[PDB]
Design a binder for this molecule. Structure first.
Ligand SMILES: O=C(O)[C@@](O)(COP(=O)(O)O)[C@H](O)[C@H](O)COP(=O)(O)O
Ligand SMILES: O=C(O)[C@@](O)(COP(=O)(O)O)[C@H](O)[C@H](O)COP(=O)(O)O
Ligand SMILES: [Mg+2]
Ligand SMILES: [Mg+2]
Ligand SMILES: [Mg+2]
Lengths: 129, 467, 467, 187, 129, 129
């Protein structure tokens, strides 16, 4: 079991040199970099716990990496992701999202089947952890 | 000029060279090939005439209404470079002629009876300008690019798809099994074929149930929000609403619709999708009947403009490197029409008018038809991120299985996006990046050996005239 | 033949020369122009492939379903006489692939993705055979030729019509006045223009009220059942049903519908018109986009076959002598498609398959577009009695008025029918009969002087290949 | 084919077996077999699920499906009726059923029966691990009562409902249209 | 507790000699033999994890048995079943289904009762394992 | 995790001297003081287990404190709250509510997401303890 929520999931775990290169692309195009963490990695779960405020005007990829290492020390067994936010006329949304830190063992999902009218089933996804 | 008799369209008052179009005027281009003897000025005025308020002979009832406002006016005619006997014709239409929030009325006026004229050999509609006053009457796409990606929680790369193969034949039980193996492998979307509806071998209501169980089982095992484009195309609207309401009842993310059903039927689902939180997919079936020919028909960029106003979130725009017709520069034109909020005039890409959409939702373009893992570097360079790549044959036709084929395409795309953002040139180093990823990924290596020399290269019919 | 890899369509099992089609098989002709290097056998199999159950590479899921039944088979390929590089291709489809009572599903299969193929330069759908098993699933036209004439109590001659001119501009009050003067003069029908819907200058609900008062006032003063084709074409289906229900509420005989709205939307009104006793009129707007070209598109005879199955009582089929495109022999082909219950194979008229409709209602064809009183002898000789002749310009554009113009066309037609039944040749003596009637009829004499030398003669694009 | 209405059993029987039986010149007539053309069979929708469609829903393959009629025919109250159903399905039976004469008698109301058997079905389904079913009899005096019984059967989540032949072909074709549009198997 | 999903469930556990005889019947009639496994043996749960591709053109019952023993080594505590697939004009479906390997202890099902309108109950079947 | 149901939740835990001062305000205005306890501290859970009858006619804040200490001895690991009840013409309801005793460790809430029609979700909050 491995939760593939976000980009670069099928690729092997990204090293600090690779993360620094990916943030450099986000800051080059002019996106706000934000760190988010959770212990509940449900699909379609929208809001993760924000690690401070998003870095809007930061022209250094090294500055993000310090905050990333600080978040890892505070939350070891949590899903940490980087969100790049676009602030243009039409977009006004997240552009990049990738998990940089995932826990020692990934939790599985149990599916509960509720029988309703006819042959229709309501599905409920729940995390074991 | 109101006495009984037959008069020429230029003499009647439809051609005016000194006319400057206003900001509130619908502009249309026509690539007209006139008959031997017919003047290009007369050819333009004939197109400008019948498309608005004209008949072959003069009527006295014209003196009742203020004709000077209602008549369409052709303002300039220029010869097409390259071709000896072909002309561009710019026709201006006033907003008084068009119904607010209707695609069917817009087409009944402009492309009504002008094509079937005897004095013209072949006419083609190249591009159309819509004023800001006219675009605001339409609702636009239900979600858009921004709205859709927030629902699926997927950012930073193209969304992956696959068509369930074969096209027809599979029963309800087995159909979902192909869907299940596709989505769990790494694909974001699976889809119904455009001809699949409610055939004698497999009923629609059975298909809808079995794919939704396959979607949720894949969603639990991968941890991603998965979807299947459920085909709702039916004979009547009563059957069509019943198929959509059952799709909502199961809890589907996105439903697909064929282009054949008609703009009146399309606009009805766009109203329905917004009022029930559904993403709409458009499959262009039978488009190549009136699009492929360069001398006659309607260019796809005009159809894409109508479909954006009608309200569709997804649209097949074409692949430059695929099995189907498409020229790299002309294809990029269709992509800029449905994505960019404001597009400037660019003659190599086939854009002739400066279009301002004024805060209408961005249609996500879909690249499909004869593509694989070896074509990944060319697809990412031409279009970008906000696209949907569909691998119908390139996933299921994998020697190992369906799960391996879905993993092969996912690893290939993830390797390219990572290389592009780091600063490596994806146009030259592209093949080398895919080979380097094949060292650790075994399903990707098998996919590259199968379709390595297989490339669809043919002379494009729909090409630019300024190259 | 099921191992992973790209194989040719002829090798895959889509071409079979020894195949004889069964009585329960949908047959389709394709006028294929292949690319330089592409074999006509391979070109046929590519069309036969994608239109049914094929993809570019071989899948293992083909072994699940019984593919030998589901695959479409091209059985014979013959070169077109006259053209050096063009081929006829006969493709057979099984009933297992088609949904019962759906035009949209039929088009999604056959004309789906075959046009946009790279190995083909230009493809055209010439003719289509429907089995007796497939035609019975459809309801057919609401009334037909027999059903309509009994309602109006008019027998023995063509029904006369006129389009309200100008196209756009007239307000609700004045629009009905043109209708009133037309119907009282001698016309059986008046009509809305194809672009007229619900414009800012005149609302639809106002138009509907004022024309119905004009119909009933004309009906009281002439003693005949009069009608006006009320245009219901709208943006959405919800608006479209509301316009139809109000048309029924006023007590209208017949409503008109544009072709643009789509087959899914068309089949919905056909179900509605039968359940509310209404006659349906079809106006072919934007047909010439994919019909006019001889090398590419869909021939109108196939569209007429679909529209008969969808369920329309009236259809514009074209005029040989009019302002719009049409060849005398090819035009007669479209008339035989929608009228005759059983039509035999005739190569000069463009019929390739022996079609048996099996007791479906006869669609009444409409001749319109650039005709007058001087063309009356040619119209009666080519078609016959069960037709609708429409004089848009030839009625209102009369120097005396609208009432005189309507009388001129009525006297001209009545003189020709009387001469034809007596035993006089209407092809040679035709002009002399109209001149002899002008001695006692003064409005007819004025009409012949205005449009005597005015004739639309141009080279037809859609022509036969066996002449 | 000109004599027959498209998609109607009632019209087909009104023509062929109409008045020919009651003829004086014939002692006894019997209809042995009937041929339908391909043109005529396509007008009809056919069975809602079929053999293929039903077995995929129940996930049971390779042997005949087992059933049992709840005995006695009439007499059992709603509470006790479900107890016989519960003991049957848990033992090894795939289906239990209502008797053809059981509808809405004074001793046991239909809406009470429907509730108690569905609890018995789900209790048996949890203890065996198989999809179980009960043929719920919807046969009523009027169509208005008959649709209300079917809609409540769907609301409980029943797999399959049963219908008597007596109700008539016009009434039968109406449920066939209903069962397809609500995913129900017809007995 | 014993899950009776499929054929030959009430009969005692089938030996390798008996399984070979049952597959021989399936290959004789011309059916594709496929192996499927799961840890979630819910009723009406349609899709189990497929062990490779179905054996379409195999005229030897011994060849299936090798793949069966390979699946048992990989998944010891799982429900392994054999599915025979018919590929004719009308059928195009599974014909035979029987569990060949079931785990050491069978999991029970818990039924949750949700009270809705009137006296109607929505039932939810859930596996303890 | 800390359940903030009621007044004075964000403030530190109230001492017996502070509680006596708060009850004195309630008895001064003429409110009936009642003690309530539960092990299920769900949001919108209305009815807690009442510790005897509400003190209607008691003009001493010390008398409430004796019953509070008696409730703590009987139920150590439970949420004890004080409810002041108004008995006027228009009110006839609770006026003050604050937790005085909360257990050693606060239980967390698990959220189950049931997918219904469209994109709508039914939420179910459940206590781990
Ligand atoms: O039917 C097909 O060919 C496809 O499923 C692609 O399959 P493969 O991936 O197996 O080729 C698509 O529907 C076409 O792309 C439609 O054309 P367009 O993209 O022009 O709408
Ligand atoms: O708009 C017009 O030109 C007409 O009103 C004819 O007017 P006139 O009689 O004044 O020419 C008809 O709608 C055309 O015949 C439509 O084409 P088709 O017949 O091909 O459907
Ligand atoms: Mg397709
Ligand atoms: Mg017109
Ligand atoms: Mg019985």
């Amino acid at each position: 079991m491995r939760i593939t929520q976000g980009c670069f999931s099928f690729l092997p775990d990204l090293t600090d040199e690779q993360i620094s290169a990916q943030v450099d692309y986000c800051l080059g195009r002019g996106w706000a970099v934000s760190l988010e963490h959770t212990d509940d990695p449900h699909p379609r779960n929208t809001y993760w716990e924000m690690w401070g405020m998003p870095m809007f005007d930061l022209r250094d990829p090294k500055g993000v990496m310090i905050e990333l290492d600080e978040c890892r020390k505070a939350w070891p067994g949590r899903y940490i992701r980087i969100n790049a936010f676009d602030s243009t006329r039409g977009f006004e949304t997240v552009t990049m999202s990738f998990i940089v830190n995932r826990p020692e063992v990934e939790p599985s999902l149990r599916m509960e089947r509720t029988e309703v009218d006819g042959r229709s089933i309501r599905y409920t996804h729940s995390i074991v952890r | 000029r109101y006495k009984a008799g037959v008069l020429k369209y230029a003499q009647m008052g439809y051609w005016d060279g000194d006319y400057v179009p206003k900001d509130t005027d619908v502009l249309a281009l026509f690539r007209i090939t006139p008959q031997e003897g017919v003047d290009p000025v007369e050819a333009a005025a004939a197109v400008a005439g019948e498309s608005s308020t004209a008949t072959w002979t003069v009527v006295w009832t014209d003196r009742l209404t203020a004709c000077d406002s209602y008549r369409a006016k052709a303002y300039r005619v220029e010869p097409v470079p390259g071709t000896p006997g072909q002309y561009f014709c710019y026709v201006a239409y006033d907003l008084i002629l068009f119904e607010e929030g209707s695609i069917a009325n817009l087409t009944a006026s402009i492309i009504g009876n002008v094509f079937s004229f005897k004095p013209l050999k072949a006419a083609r509609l190249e591009d159309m300008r819509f004023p800001v006053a006219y675009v605001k009457t339409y609702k636009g796409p239900p979600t858009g690019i921004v709205g859709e990606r927030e629902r699926l929680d997927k950012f930073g790369k193209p969304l992956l798809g696959a068509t369930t193969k074969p096209k027809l034949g599979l029963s309800g039980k087995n159909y979902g099994r192909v869907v299940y193996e596709g989505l769990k492998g790494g694909l974001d979307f699976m889809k119904d074929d455009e001809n699949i509806n409610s055939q004698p071998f497999m009923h629609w209501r059975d298909r809808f149930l079995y794919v939704m169980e396959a979607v949720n089982l894949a969603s639990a095992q991968t941890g991603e929000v998965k979807g299947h484009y459920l085909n709702i195309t039916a004979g009547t609207m009563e059957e069509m609403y019943r198929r959509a309401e059952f799709a909502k009842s199961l809890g589907s993310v996105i439903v697909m619709v064929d282009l054949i059903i008609g703009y009146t039927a399309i606009q009805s689902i766009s109203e329905w999708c917004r009022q029930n939180d559904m993403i709409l997919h458009m499959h262009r079936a039978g488009h190549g009947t009136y699009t492929r020919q360069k001398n006659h028909g309607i260019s796809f960029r005009v159809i894409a403009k109508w479909l954006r106003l009608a309200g569709v979130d997804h649209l097949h725009c074409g692949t430059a490197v695929g099995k189907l017709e498409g020229d790299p520069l002309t294809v990029q034109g269709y992509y800029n029409v449905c994505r960019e909020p404001f597009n400037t005039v660019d003659l190599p890409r086939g854009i002739f008018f400066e279009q301002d959409w004024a805060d209408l939702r961005k249609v996500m373009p879909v690249a499909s038809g004869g593509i694989h893992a070896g074509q990944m570097h060319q697809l990412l360079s031409l279009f970008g991120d906000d696209v949907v790549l569909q691998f119908g044959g390139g996933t299921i036709g994998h020697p190992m299985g369906i799960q391996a084929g879905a993993t092969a395409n996912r690893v290939a795309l993830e390797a390219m996006v990572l290389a592009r953002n780091e600063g490596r040139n994806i146009d030259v180093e592209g093949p080398e990046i895919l080979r380097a990823a094949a060292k650790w990924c075994k399903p990707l290596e098998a996919a590259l050996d199968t379709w390595g020399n297989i490339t669809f290269n043919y002379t494009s019919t729909d090409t630019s005239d300024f190259v």
